[PDB]
Amino acid sequence: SPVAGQKYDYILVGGGTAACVLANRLSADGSKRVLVLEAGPDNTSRDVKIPAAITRLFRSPLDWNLFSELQEQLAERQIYMARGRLLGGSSATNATLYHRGAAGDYDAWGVEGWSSEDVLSWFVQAETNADFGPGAYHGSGGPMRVENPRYTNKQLHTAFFKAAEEVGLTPNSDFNDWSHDHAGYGTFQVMQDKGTRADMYRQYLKPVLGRRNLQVLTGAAVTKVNIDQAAGKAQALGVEFSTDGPTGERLSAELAPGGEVIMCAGAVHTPFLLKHSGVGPSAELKEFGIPVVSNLAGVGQNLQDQPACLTAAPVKEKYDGIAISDHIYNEKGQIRKRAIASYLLGGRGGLTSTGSDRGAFVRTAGQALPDLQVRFVPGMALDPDGVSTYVRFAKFQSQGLKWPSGITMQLIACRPQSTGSVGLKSADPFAPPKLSPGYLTDKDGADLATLRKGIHWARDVARSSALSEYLDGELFPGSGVVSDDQIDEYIRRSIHSSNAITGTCKMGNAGDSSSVVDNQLRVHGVEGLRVVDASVVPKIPGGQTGAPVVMIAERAAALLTGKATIG
Ligand SMILES: Cc1cc2nc3c(=O)[nH]c(=O)nc-3n(C[C@H](O)[C@H](O)[C@H](O)COP(=O)(O)OP(=O)(O)OC[C@H]3O[C@@H](n4cnc5c(N)ncnc54)[C@H](O)[C@@H]3O)c2cc1C
Ligand SMILES: CCCCCCCCCCCCCCCCCC(=O)O
Ligand SMILES: CCCCCCCCCCCCCCCCCC(=O)O
């Protein structure tokens, strides 16, 4: 009905991080008719605008509320995997940390035309930075906003940095500068604009909603890509979707001649929807009676996510009130007047923080690149699951209680060796995906070793002069968790997502039969179908995965508009 009688040059399946970038670049010249279909609503919540309100976005109506299959290797638990459900997708719900990883991460892909030297200019193109001017590693003038965080904890941030230095870590003045080594401690830059969230809805899509050639539908849940098998195999015709959930009528948006469907549903829902479209491992599609259009073993394989555990310690009584928890809430859980005034008057203070924006990259055992990311938070976890503790922190408002003052160090396996999968547990495209993160399944136990050594490193840092001045014992993992076996059990029971998720429709070279797209991001064996999102990442870079997704979308837009070639 909203697409009755229209023809589109591009249909974007999803309106998330990548989709917002493509919607902007593909609609620019006026010539091309662009449709965006997002299952979630418009992006208007104040909980999206205010970085500290990330606490409220977890397990909210603006999240998919995905749980994994039971993981036997993780004390038989289902793992929550946060995913944004609105225009801007996970860019609208994420911790805003700005990471590209290292040059070596893109070289390790081994994909023609996607080396570190190929991708650098596409990172720089996206960027405006408040703290770095033009140079080899930074642009000015791009639609993204990046800045140094506009909250600083006076006592605890400086203490973390001195502590890191005491255990022999060097400062890294720019984690995105590929002319020096990735390892070191410092401040993560953030995708914020004077302390408001600078998500890809705000930066890319919202400014161009006026364009007559761009049509964006919210509440539009795609159910499959329409693919025809006629005189020379499989051709995308468009997309089936409902505007009224499962019971709603199945509408179809149609491509114009020469049009393309671009999958932007992200590393969870893209492979799910491809499988619902007959693109996937033929045995999985047969099991739910889906006709196989393109038998691709790689669809939903190679799921890479960066698993996390944490240590937490209270401060001494005489340091009560110095934590970010004290800067956001008073002792009866009301939002501090000062935090509201600083946010509104100057885009400063606790409300501009997602909490996790200082830390380090560490080599636990002589690896080529750091295996460990540390995220230092100047507040104390009340749960060994940091995502559960963020949810508790949002629920804590107005409860009449005092959050105890202290610190957390989150330990992430940032270059994990384990992989998971996403598939179907049903033929109904409205049912949740069969999600398995596959944490700690790698053959050598490398990921478990990374996190075990992370906990040792966090204990060494907390034992430092700099931090032991402030701290009063340890809450997590606590005195019961000392031996390697005790630490391994604690990690199995508490391991959570640091919210990356890549690689489920991986890009590959010619001859790579585990790949789903070529180096032009085209789905093997289907005409008029591309993937442009986190799904195409061959091998997860170190650090948070949002900026790499924006780099891929910018380059894909340039390829599709004829402004660039690849290979
Ligand atoms: C909680 C959290 C914290 C993170 N922290 C950081 C961080 O600090 N820094 C960082 O750089 N990265 C971070 N990440 C990762 C980063 O946000 C993502 O990797 C990135 O946003 C992915 O972009 P994408 O376009 O691949 O997918 P998304 O941005 O997730 O977009 C997918 C879109 O498709 C939509 N969709 C799904 N199914 C359908 C359907 N059937 N029909 C229509 N639409 C559909 C979804 O609703 C969504 O809007 C975080 C992620 C999360 C979730
Ligand atoms: C639980 C910790 C996060 C809570 C954050 C909520 C803060 C609410 C404070 C009241 C401020 C509301 C008005 C200012 C915000 C408007 C959003 C914006 O335009 O940037
Ligand atoms: C955003 C500001 C909230 C700060 C108050 C929280 C106080 C306790 C700190 C808990 C830290 C655990 C580390 C978890 C980071 C989880 C969210 C994420 O993946 O971005």
Side-chain angles (χ1 to χ4, degrees):
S1 199
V3 300
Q6 333 245 247
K7 293 244 180 290
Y8 303 96
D9 305 307
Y10 297 107
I11 310 180
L12 306 189
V13 172
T17 312
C20 288
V21 175
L22 283 183
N24 177 300
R25 301 300 187 189
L26 295 176
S27 66
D29 72 357
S31 50
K32 291 298 193 302
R33 189 136 170 75
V34 180
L35 182 62
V36 179
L37 300 166
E38 170 59 44
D42 193 7
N43 184 325
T44 59
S45 175
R46 296 185 159 169
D47 289 341
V48 167
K49 297 182 156 52
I50 301 169
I54 191 185
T55 59
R56 300 173 163 183
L57 294 173
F58 287 113
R59 296 287 277 117
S60 78
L62 299 178
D63 193 83
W64 286 93
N65 288 285
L66 295 163
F67 289 75
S68 82
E69 299 311 292
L70 274 174
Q71 306 284 296
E72 49 140 55
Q73 85 286 8
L74 309 185
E76 296 213 57
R77 303 190 291 127
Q78 298 184 264
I79 306 294
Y80 174 48
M81 303 186 74
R83 283 299 100 169
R85 189 175 177 284
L86 72 158
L87 289 175
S90 297
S91 73
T93 73
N94 74 13
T96 76
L97 308 193
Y98 181 72
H99 286 289
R100 296 175 196 170
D105 288 323
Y106 302 87
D107 294 329
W109 289 8
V111 176
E112 180 72 11
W114 291 85
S115 72
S116 56
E117 293 205 313
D118 298 307
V119 298
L120 184 48
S121 67
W122 297 98
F123 282 117
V124 166
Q125 218 258 6
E127 182 182 22
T128 297
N129 203 300
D131 290 281
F132 296 101
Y137 301 111
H138 298 285
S140 205
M144 293 184 80
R145 292 296 181 275
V146 180
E147 61 190 19
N148 292 356
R150 288 167 70 88
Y151 170 75
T152 306
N153 192 299
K154 162 188 165 155
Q155 295 102 329
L156 293 176
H157 277 141
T158 260
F160 169 70
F161 294 149
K162 283 194 194 291
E165 194 171 317
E166 281 187 57
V167 298
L169 215 58
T170 172
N172 188 330
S173 56
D174 181 2
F175 291 104
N176 297 310
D177 187 326
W178 290 348
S179 78
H180 68 238
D181 183 64
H182 200 219
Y185 72 85
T187 308
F188 307 142
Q189 290 202 294
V190 296
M191 288 177 287
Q192 297 179 24
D193 184 12
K194 301 308 196 144
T196 336
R197 181 180 291 278
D199 71 47
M200 297 321 112
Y201 174 75
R202 197 184 174 270
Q203 304 311 121
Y204 280 88
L205 178 63
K206 188 147 104 86
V208 304
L209 284 176
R211 289 173 180 169
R212 281 198 212 290
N213 58 318
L214 176 65
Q215 171 178 14
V216 175
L217 303 179
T218 61
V222 172
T223 53
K224 63 164 188 195
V225 180
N226 299 318
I227 304 177
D228 183 51
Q229 287 154 306
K233 318 292 92 210
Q235 163 77 64
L237 303 171
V239 177
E240 189 185 276
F241 69 92
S242 164
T243 55
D244 200 57
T247 69
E249 191 189 336
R250 297 305 181 75
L251 307 173
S252 285
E254 293 178 10
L255 296 178
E260 303 205 49
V261 177
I262 321 288
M263 305 296 295
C264 305
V268 171
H269 287 112
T270 286
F272 176 79
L273 290 175
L274 281 183
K275 281 185 197 197
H276 274 287
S277 306
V279 178
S282 78
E284 290 176 37
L285 312 196
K286 284 178 182 181
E287 181 187 341
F288 294 100
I290 297 158
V292 183
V293 152
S294 187
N295 175 23
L296 295 177
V299 177
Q301 300 292 112
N302 187 55
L303 191 161
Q304 293 190 287
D305 189 24
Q306 300 170 337
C309 62
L310 67 82
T311 79
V315 295
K316 306 188 162 107
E317 196 171 19
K318 74 180 173 186
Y319 289 122
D320 185 53
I322 72 171
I324 190 175
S325 54
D326 303 300
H327 301 152
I328 292 173
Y329 287 145
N330 68 28
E331 73 274 34
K332 43 81 165 279
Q334 280 212 308
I335 298 148
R336 287 251 182 217
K337 173 181 197 183
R338 194 203 228 69
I340 299 168
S342 298
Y343 178 83
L344 286 173
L345 157 80
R348 296 185 182 276
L351 296 189
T352 72
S353 194
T354 58
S356 64
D357 56 14
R358 279 62 172 192
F361 287 95
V362 178
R363 284 176 179 89
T364 61
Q367 303 87 336
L369 289 173
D371 61 311
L372 181 64
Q373 183 191 19
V374 184
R375 301 204 288 189
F376 173 83
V377 186
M380 196 186 70
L382 283 178
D383 309 81
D385 184 324
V387 175
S388 299
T389 232
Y390 266 35
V391 172
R392 179 194 298 280
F393 185 92
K395 289 191 174 155
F396 200 73
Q397 186 167 350
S398 304
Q399 297 310 294
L401 302 165
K402 211 270 191 185
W403 194 285
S405 310
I407 69 139
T408 309
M409 280 173 279
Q410 198 188 37
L411 309 136
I412 303 178
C414 54
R415 289 177 173 103
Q417 294 192 44
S418 305
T419 68
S421 66
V422 44
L424 313 187
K425 28 161 42 165
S426 144
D428 170 13
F430 290 94
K434 201 196 198 200
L435 194 45
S436 172
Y439 300 151
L440 311 184
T441 60
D442 72 276
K443 55 131 98 155
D444 304 319
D447 292 348
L448 179 61
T450 292
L451 294 183
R452 178 198 310 122
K453 290 176 182 153
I455 287 175
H456 293 315
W457 186 93
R459 283 182 161 164
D460 297 336
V461 158
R463 184 197 317 122
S464 72
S465 310
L467 270 174
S468 65
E469 165 59 26
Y470 293 94
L471 301 183
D472 191 359
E474 182 188 283
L475 175 62
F476 298 122
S479 55
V481 183
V482 181
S483 79
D484 284 351
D485 287 5
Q486 289 163 2
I487 292 172
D488 291 355
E489 217 36 44
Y490 166 82
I491 295 166
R492 281 180 196 106
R493 294 190 199 196
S494 61
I495 194 161
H496 48 280
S497 184
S498 79
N499 307 304
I501 319 185
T502 67
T504 53
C505 295
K506 87 162 197 254
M507 200 183 44
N509 280 335
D512 181 355
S513 50
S514 80
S515 66
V516 176
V517 304
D518 62 15
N519 72 348
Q520 317 285 305
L521 305 175
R522 293 178 305 186
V523 174
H524 302 315
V526 184
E527 280 290 16
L529 186 60
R530 306 222 199 184
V531 181
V532 185
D533 61 33
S535 311
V536 306
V537 173
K539 200 149 149 46
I540 195 166
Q544 287 58 59
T545 52
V549 168
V550 172
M551 178 276 289
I552 289 167
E554 286 280 31
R555 197 188 189 188
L559 179 73
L560 289 168
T561 59
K563 288 188 186 176
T565 60
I566 298 181

